[PDB]
């Protein structure tokens, strides 16, 4: 019966998703609706800024992409994927896209501001999470991937840098730059080196099973404090990933190592999340035996910690970044390429 409820929930969620997928929102604000405050993070396409929406006084995180840089990096379709998908999804652990628009120079995605900082920052500072704390975060990713995959979406960039902690201590996934809706296999070389599945590195067709591999990398890094495969040169990271070998800290519980051997499985025909039982091989694993999946979804579980908050618009949980003045050209750049944005 629990499984049928999940089925019915995801069926209704897909009906809502497809309505927005087929009829995406467009041009729902403009730049001078916002006061720009501070850069929260940077990336190859641009930067994410803390902004204040003038008419409501709400704070948001505004992702800014330079259209010319997107084109140079061959990320046009990925960027169209990112916005089309983000404006259509709805889940507790996915950041909410509130507005989007473009101008002569840039694309803008305006998201709910998540004030607690990147999981990356807390994880590096504290060293490692306890297994209960790592389980709390991991359970949210499990449910988020069950949601995304049911919509034929593959996320493809799971890492602590992309997981934000909200004021309740829960996770918000951001950065859908590599998210893709696909029923077949796909082939694009993309992701982050430490998190790449072997079939990506080896240039095979791949599917949603790469997200479950990446979950194994995330859980490992959360509980160990370092990822299962690292080296100073990416090539050496890839050699470790495809080798089939993995070692675990001596403090890893027996259940945690068994779960990770089934997630960090090089053989697609054996990898948890890709078998006949789908995600239920993960949700029913002994390591998750105390996890109340509904309570997690409803945010009724006490969080490991609540991030510090001095006030609204406070960024103390984020690093400082060099500020650059947002310039808008007098001429429209790349209009045809981004016409649907």
């Amino acid at each position: 019966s629990e499984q049928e409820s999940v089925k019915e929930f995801l069926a209704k969620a897909k009906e809502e998703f497809l309505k927005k997928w087929e009829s995406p929102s467009q041009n729902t604000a403009q730049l001078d609706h916002f006061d720009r405050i501070k850069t929260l993070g940077t990336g190859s396409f641009g930067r994410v800024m803390l902004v204040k929406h003038k008419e409501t006084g709400n704070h948001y995180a505004m992702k800014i992409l330079d259209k010319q840089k997107v084109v140079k990096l061959k990320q046009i379709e990925h960027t169209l994927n990112e916005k089309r998908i983000l404006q259509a999804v709805n889940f507790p652990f996915l950041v909410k896209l509130e507005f989007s628009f473009k101008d002569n120079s840039n694309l803008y995605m305006v998201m709910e501001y998540v004030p607690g900082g990147e999981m990356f920052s807390h994880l590096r500072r504290i060293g490692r999470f306890s297994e209960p704390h790592a389980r709390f975060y991991a359970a949210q990713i499990v449910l988020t991937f069950e949601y995304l995959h049911s919509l034929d979406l593959i996320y493809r960039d799971l890492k602590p840098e992309n997981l934000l902690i909200d004021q309740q201590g829960y996770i918000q996934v951001t950065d859908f730059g590599f998210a893709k809706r696909v029923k077949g296999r796909t082939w694009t070389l993309c992701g982050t080196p430490e998190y790449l599945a072997p079939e990506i590195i080896l240039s095979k067709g791949y599917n949603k099973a790469v997200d479950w591999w990446a979950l194994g990398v995330l859980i490992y890094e959360m509980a160990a404090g370092y990822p299962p495969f690292f080296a100073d040169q990416p090539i050496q990271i890839y050699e470790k990933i495809v080798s089939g070998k993995v070692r675990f800290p001596s403090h890893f519980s027996s259940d945690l190592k068994d779960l990770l051997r089934n997630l960090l499985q090089v053989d697609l025909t054996k990898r948890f999340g890709n078998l006949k039982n789908g995600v239920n091989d993960i949700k029913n694993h002994k390591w998750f035996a105390t996890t109340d999946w509904i309570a997690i979804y409803q945010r009724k579980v006490e969080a490991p910690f609540i991030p510090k908050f001095k006030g609204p618009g406070d960024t103390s949980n984020f690093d400082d970044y060099e500020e650059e003045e947002i310039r808008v050209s007098i001429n429209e750049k790349c209009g045809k390429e981004f016409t649907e944005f």
Partner: peptide, 19 residues
């Protein structure tokens, strides 16, 4: 220790995506 090796490595900062 593996942790000491990690902390001394070049990969403890934010990791860029590849493509």
């Amino acid at each position: 220790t593996t942790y000491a090796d990690f902390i001394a490595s070049g990969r403890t900062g934010r990791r860029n995506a590849i493509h």
